[PDB]
PDB file of C-alpha atoms in Angstrom:
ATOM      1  CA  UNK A   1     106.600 -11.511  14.552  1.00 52.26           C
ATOM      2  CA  UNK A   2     104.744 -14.221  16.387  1.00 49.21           C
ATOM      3  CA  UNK A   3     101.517 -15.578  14.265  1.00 50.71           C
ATOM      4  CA  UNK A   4      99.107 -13.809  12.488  1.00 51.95           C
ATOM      5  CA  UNK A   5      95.452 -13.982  13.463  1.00 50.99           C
ATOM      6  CA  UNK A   6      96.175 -16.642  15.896  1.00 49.03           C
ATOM      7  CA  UNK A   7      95.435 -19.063  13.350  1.00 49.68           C
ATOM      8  CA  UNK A   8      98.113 -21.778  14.119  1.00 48.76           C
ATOM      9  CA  UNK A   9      97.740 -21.014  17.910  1.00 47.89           C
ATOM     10  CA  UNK A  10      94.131 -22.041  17.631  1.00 51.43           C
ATOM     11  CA  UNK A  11      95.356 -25.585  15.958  1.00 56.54           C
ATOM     12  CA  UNK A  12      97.281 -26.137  19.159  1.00 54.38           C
ATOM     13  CA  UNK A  13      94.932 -24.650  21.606  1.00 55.86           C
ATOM     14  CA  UNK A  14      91.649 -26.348  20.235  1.00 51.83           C
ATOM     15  CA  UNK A  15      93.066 -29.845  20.724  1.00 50.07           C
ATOM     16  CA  UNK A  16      93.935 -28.765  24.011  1.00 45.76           C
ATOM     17  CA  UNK A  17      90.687 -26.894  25.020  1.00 48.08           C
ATOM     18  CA  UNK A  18      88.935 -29.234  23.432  1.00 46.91           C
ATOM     19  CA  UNK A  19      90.513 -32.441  25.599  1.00 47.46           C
ATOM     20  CA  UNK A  20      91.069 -29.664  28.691  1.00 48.99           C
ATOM     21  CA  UNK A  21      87.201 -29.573  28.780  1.00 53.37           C
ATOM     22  CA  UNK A  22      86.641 -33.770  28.961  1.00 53.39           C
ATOM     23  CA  UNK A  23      89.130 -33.750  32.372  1.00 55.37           C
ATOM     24  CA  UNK A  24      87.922 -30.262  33.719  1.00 55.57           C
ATOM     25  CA  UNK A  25      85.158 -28.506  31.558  1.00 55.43           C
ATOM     26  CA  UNK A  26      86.657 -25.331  33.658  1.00 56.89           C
ATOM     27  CA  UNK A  27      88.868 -24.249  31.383  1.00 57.94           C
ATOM     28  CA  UNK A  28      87.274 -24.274  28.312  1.00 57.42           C
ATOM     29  CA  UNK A  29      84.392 -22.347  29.937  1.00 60.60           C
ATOM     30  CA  UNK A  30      86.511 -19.043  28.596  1.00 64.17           C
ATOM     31  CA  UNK A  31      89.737 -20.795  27.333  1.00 63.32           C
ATOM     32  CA  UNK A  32      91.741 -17.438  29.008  1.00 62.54           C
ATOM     33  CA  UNK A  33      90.543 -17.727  32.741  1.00 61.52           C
ATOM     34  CA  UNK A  34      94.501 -16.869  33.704  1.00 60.29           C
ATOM     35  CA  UNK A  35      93.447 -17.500  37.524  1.00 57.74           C
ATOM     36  CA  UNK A  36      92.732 -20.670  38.988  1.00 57.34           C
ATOM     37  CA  UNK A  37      92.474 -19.483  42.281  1.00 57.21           C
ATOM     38  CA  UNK A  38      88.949 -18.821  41.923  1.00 58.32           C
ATOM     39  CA  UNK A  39      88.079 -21.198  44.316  1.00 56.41           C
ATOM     40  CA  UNK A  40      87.376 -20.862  48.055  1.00 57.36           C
ATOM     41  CA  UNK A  41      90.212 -23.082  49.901  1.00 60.55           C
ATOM     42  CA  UNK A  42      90.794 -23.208  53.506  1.00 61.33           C
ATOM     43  CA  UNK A  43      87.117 -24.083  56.083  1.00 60.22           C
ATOM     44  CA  UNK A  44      88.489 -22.649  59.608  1.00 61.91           C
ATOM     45  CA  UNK A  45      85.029 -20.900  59.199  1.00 62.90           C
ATOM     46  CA  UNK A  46      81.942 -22.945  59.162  1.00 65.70           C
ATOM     47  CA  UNK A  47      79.804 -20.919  61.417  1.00 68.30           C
ATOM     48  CA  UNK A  48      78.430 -18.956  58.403  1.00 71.21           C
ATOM     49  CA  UNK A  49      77.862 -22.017  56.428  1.00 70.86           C
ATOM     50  CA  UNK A  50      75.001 -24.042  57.906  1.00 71.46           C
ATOM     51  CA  UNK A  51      72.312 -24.046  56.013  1.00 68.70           C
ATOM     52  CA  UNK A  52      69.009 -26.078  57.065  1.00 64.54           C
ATOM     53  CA  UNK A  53      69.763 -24.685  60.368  1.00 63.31           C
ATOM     54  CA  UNK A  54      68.853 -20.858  60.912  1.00 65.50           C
ATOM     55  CA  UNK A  55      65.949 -20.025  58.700  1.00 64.53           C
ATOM     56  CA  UNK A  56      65.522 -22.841  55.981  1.00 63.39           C
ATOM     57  CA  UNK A  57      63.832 -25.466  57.440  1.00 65.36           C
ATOM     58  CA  UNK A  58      64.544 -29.501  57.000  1.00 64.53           C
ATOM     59  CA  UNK A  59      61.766 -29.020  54.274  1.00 65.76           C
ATOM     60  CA  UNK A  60      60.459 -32.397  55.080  1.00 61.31           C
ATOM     61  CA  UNK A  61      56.692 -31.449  53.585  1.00 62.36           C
ATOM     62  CA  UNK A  62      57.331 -32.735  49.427  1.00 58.06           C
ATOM     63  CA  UNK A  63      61.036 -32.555  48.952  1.00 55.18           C
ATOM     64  CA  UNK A  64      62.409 -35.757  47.347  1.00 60.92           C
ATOM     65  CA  UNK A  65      62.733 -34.789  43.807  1.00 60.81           C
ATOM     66  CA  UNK A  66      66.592 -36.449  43.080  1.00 62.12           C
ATOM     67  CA  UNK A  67      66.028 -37.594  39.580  1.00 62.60           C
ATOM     68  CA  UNK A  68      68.284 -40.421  40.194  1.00 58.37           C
ATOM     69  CA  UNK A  69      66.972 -43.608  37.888  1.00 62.28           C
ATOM     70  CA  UNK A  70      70.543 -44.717  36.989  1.00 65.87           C
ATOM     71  CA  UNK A  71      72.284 -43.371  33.756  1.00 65.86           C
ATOM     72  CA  UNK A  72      71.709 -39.634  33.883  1.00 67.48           C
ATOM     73  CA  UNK A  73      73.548 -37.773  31.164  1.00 65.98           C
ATOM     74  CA  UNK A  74      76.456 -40.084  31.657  1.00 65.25           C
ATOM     75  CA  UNK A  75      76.412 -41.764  28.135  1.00 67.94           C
ATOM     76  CA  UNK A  76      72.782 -41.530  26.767  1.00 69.56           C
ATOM     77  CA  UNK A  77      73.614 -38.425  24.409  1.00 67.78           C
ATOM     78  CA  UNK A  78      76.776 -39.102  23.006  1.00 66.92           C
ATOM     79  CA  UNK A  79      77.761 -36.623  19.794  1.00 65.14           C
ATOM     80  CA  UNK A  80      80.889 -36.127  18.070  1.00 63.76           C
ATOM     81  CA  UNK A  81      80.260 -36.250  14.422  1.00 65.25           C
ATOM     82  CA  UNK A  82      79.360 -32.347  13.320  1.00 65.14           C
ATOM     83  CA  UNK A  83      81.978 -31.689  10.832  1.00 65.30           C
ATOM     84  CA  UNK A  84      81.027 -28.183   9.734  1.00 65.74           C
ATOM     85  CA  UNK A  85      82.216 -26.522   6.681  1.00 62.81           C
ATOM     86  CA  UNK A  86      83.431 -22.855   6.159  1.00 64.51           C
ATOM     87  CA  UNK A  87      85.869 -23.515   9.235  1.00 62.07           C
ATOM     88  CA  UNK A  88      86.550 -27.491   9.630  1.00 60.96           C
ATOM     89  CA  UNK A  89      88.736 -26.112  12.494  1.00 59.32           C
ATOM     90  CA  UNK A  90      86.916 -28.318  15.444  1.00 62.13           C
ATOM     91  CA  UNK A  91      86.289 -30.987  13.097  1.00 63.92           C
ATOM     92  CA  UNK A  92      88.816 -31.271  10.599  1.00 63.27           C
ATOM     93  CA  UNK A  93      92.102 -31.405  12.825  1.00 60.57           C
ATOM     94  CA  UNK A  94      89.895 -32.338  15.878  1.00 62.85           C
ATOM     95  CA  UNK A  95      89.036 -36.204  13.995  1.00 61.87           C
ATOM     96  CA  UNK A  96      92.384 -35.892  12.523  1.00 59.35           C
ATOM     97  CA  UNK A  97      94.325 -35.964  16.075  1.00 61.66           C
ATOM     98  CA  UNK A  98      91.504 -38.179  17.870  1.00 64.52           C
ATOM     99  CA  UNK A  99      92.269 -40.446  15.352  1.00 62.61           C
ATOM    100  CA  UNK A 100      95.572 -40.879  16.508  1.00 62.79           C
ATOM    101  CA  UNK A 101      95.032 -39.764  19.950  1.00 64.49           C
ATOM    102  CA  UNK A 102      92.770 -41.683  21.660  1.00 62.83           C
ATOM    103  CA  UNK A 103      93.892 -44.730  19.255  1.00 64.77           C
ATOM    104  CA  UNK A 104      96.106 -45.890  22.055  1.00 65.20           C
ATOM    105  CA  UNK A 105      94.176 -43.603  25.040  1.00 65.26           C
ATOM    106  CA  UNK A 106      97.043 -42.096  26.330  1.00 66.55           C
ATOM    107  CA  UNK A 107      99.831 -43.144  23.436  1.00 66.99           C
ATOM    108  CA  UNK A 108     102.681 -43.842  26.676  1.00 69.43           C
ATOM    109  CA  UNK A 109     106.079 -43.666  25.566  1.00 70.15           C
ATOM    110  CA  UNK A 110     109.741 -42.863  26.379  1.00 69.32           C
ATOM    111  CA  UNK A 111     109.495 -39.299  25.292  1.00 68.76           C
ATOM    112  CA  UNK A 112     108.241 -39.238  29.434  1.00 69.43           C
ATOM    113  CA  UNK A 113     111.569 -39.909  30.685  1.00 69.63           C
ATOM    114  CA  UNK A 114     113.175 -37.050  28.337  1.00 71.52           C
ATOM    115  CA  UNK A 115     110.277 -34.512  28.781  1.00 70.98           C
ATOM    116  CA  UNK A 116     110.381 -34.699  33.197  1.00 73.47           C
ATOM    117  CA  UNK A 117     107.502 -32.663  33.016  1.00 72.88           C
ATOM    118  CA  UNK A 118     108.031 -30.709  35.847  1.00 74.46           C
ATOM    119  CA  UNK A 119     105.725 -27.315  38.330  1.00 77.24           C
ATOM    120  CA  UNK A 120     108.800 -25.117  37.287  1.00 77.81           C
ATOM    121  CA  UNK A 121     108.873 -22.428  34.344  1.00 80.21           C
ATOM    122  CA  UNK A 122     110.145 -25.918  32.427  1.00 78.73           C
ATOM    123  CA  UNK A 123     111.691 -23.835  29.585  1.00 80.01           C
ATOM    124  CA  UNK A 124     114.318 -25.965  29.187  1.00 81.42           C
ATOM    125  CA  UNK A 125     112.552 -29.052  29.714  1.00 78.21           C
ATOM    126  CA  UNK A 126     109.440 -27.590  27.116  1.00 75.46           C
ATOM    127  CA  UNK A 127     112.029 -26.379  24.226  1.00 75.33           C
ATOM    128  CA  UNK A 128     113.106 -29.976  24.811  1.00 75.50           C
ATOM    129  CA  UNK A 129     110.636 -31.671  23.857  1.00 74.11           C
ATOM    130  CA  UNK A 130     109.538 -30.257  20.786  1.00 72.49           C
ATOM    131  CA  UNK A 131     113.581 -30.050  20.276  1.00 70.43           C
ATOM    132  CA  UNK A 132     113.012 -34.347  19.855  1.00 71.07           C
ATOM    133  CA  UNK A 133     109.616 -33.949  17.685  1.00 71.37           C
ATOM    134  CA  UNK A 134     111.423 -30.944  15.307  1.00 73.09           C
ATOM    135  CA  UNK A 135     114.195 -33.643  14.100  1.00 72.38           C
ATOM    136  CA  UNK A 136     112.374 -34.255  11.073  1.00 69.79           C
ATOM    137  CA  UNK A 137     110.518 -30.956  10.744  1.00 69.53           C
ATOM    138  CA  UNK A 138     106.444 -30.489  11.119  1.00 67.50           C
ATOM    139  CA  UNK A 139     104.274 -31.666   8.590  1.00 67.25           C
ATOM    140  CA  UNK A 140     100.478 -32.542   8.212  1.00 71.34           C
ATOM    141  CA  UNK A 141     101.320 -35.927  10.209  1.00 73.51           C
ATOM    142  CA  UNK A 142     103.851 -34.645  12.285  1.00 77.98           C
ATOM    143  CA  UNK A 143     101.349 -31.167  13.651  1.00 76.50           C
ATOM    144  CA  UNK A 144      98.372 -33.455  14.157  1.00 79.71           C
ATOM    145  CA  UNK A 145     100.423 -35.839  16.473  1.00 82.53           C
ATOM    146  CA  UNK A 146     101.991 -32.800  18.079  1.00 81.96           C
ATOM    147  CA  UNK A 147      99.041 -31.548  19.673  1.00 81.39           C
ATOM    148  CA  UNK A 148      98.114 -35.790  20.998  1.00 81.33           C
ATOM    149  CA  UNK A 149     101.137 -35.031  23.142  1.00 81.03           C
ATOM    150  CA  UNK A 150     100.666 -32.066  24.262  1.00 82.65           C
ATOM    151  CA  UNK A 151      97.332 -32.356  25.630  1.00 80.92           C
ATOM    152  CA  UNK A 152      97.818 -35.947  26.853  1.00 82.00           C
ATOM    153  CA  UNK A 153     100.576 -34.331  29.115  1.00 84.58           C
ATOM    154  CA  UNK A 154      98.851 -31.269  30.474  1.00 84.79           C
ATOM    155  CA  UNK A 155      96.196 -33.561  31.659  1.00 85.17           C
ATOM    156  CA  UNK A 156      98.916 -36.117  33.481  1.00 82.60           C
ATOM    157  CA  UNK A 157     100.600 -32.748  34.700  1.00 80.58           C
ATOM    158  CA  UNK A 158      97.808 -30.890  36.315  1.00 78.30           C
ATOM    159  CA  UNK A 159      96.847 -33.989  38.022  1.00 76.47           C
ATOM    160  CA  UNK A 160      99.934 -34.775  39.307  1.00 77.36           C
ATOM    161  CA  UNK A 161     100.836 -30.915  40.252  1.00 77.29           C
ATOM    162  CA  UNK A 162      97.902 -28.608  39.386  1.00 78.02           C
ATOM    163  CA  UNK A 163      95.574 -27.029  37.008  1.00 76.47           C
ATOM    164  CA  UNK A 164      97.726 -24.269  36.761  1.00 76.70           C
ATOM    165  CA  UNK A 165     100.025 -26.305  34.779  1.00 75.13           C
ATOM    166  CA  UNK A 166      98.205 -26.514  31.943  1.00 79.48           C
ATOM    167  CA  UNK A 167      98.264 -22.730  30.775  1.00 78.20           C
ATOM    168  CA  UNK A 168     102.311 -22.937  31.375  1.00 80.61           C
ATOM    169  CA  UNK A 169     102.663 -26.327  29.668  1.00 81.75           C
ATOM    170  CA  UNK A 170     100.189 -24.796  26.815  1.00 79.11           C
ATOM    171  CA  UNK A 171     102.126 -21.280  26.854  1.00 81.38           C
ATOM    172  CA  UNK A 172     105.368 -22.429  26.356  1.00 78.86           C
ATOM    173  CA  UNK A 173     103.724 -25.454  23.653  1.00 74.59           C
ATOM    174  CA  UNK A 174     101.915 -22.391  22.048  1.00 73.58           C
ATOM    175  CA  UNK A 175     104.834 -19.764  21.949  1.00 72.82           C
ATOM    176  CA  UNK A 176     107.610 -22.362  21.036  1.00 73.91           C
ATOM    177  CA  UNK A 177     105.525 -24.155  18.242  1.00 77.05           C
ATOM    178  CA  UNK A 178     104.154 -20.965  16.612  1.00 81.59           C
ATOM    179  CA  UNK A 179     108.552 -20.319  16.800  1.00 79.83           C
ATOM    180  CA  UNK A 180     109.287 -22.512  13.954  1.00 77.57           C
ATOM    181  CA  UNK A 181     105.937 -23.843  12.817  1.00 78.36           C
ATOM    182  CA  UNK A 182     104.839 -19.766  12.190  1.00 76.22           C
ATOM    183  CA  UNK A 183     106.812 -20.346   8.103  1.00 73.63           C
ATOM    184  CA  UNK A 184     106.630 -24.182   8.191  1.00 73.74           C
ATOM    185  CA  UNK A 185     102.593 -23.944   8.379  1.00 73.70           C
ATOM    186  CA  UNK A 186     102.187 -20.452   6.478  1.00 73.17           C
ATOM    187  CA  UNK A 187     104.453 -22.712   3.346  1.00 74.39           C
ATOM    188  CA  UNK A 188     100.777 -25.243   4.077  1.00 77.15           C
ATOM    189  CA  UNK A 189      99.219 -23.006   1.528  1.00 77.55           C
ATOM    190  CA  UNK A 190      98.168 -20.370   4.231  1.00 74.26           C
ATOM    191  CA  UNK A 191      96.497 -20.471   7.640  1.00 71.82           C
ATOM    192  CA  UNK A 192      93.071 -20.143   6.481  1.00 70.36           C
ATOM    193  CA  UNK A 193      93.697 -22.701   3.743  1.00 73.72           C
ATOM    194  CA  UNK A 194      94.894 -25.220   6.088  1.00 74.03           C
ATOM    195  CA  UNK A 195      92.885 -24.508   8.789  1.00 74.11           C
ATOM    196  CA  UNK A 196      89.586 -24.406   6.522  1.00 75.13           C
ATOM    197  CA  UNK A 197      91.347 -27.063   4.305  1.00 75.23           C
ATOM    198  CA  UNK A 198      89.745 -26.012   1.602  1.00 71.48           C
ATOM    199  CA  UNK A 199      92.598 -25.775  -0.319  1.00 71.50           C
ATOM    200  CA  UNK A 200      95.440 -27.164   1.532  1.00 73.90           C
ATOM    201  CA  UNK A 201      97.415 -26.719  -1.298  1.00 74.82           C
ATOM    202  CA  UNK A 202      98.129 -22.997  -2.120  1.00 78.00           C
ATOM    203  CA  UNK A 203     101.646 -23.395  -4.228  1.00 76.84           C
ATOM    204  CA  UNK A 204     104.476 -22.921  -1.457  1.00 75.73           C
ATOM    205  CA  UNK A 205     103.813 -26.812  -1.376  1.00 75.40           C
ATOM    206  CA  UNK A 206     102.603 -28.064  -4.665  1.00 73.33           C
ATOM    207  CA  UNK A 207     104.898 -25.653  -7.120  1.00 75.38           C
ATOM    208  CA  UNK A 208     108.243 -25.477  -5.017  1.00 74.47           C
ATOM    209  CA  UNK A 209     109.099 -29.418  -4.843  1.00 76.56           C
ATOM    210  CA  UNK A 210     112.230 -29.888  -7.160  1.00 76.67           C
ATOM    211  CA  UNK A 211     111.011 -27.713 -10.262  1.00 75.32           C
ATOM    212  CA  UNK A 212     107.724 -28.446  -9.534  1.00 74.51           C
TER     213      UNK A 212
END
């Protein structure tokens, strides 16, 4: 009895896509790559890798096309302003958590020292964490600063450990916050309700607050 229709996992696994993408625009390519060892590592063998050399030619006849004037799709195009209806769901909790998010840039804090995020399964050190951020319960404030820190660590983790962090840190985020946050978000009014917000506000939390 984990989720639904990965409604609430997709709250916690946009904002980390989402931020994932702007430090590695790898893993959002399919969001479920489960292999970053994709890559060719090692170079004991460059006899079959010199190009220009064999059959290519220097090219030295009209080839100087860089493109190169300065500020080339570095900050010329800026968007981040859609906010589409009938979903909301890269929008809604996506402006809601930058908000808060990159209001400080990386929002440092103590809860560093307690996490010890760590290249090990870090089930202890994951259940933890959320252990802290669960002494008060989860609500709308509470969810949309949840996801701040956990995709402001995954990108401090994979960079000092590996990529591969990220899908364990986000795994054991994702598994342990769909735990307790499966009724606490379903008593939002719904998944669709709150992740549409077009409701927010079903009746598990507008009719059951001390006789109503």
């Amino acid at each position: 009895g984990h989720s639904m229709s990965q409604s609430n996992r997709e709250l916690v696994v946009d904002f980390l896509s989402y931020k994932l993408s702007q430090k590695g625009y790898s893993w959002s390519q399919f969001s479920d790559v489960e292999e970053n060892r994709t890559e060719a590592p090692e170079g004991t063998e460059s006899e079959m890798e010199t190009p220009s050399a064999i059959n290519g030619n220097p090219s030295w006849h009209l080839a100087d096309s860089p493109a190169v004037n300065g500020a080339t799709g570095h900050s010329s195009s800026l968007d981040a302003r859609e906010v589409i209806p009938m979903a909301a769901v890269k929008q809604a909790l996506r402006e809601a958590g930058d908000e808060f998010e990159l209001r400080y840039r990386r929002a440092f804090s103590d809860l560093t020292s307690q996490l010890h995020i760590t290249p090990g399964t870090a089930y202890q050190s994951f259940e933890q964490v959320v252990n802290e951020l669960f002494r008060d319960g989860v609500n709308w404030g509470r969810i949309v600063a949840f996801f701040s820190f956990g995709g402001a660590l995954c990108v401090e983790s994979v960079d000092k450990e590996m990529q591969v962090l990220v899908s364990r840190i986000a795994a054991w985020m994702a598994t342990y916050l769909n735990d307790h946050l499966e009724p606490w978000i379903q008593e939002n009014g719904g998944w669709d309700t709150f992740v549409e917000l077009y409701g927010n506000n079903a009746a598990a939390e507008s009719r059951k607050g001390q006789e109503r």
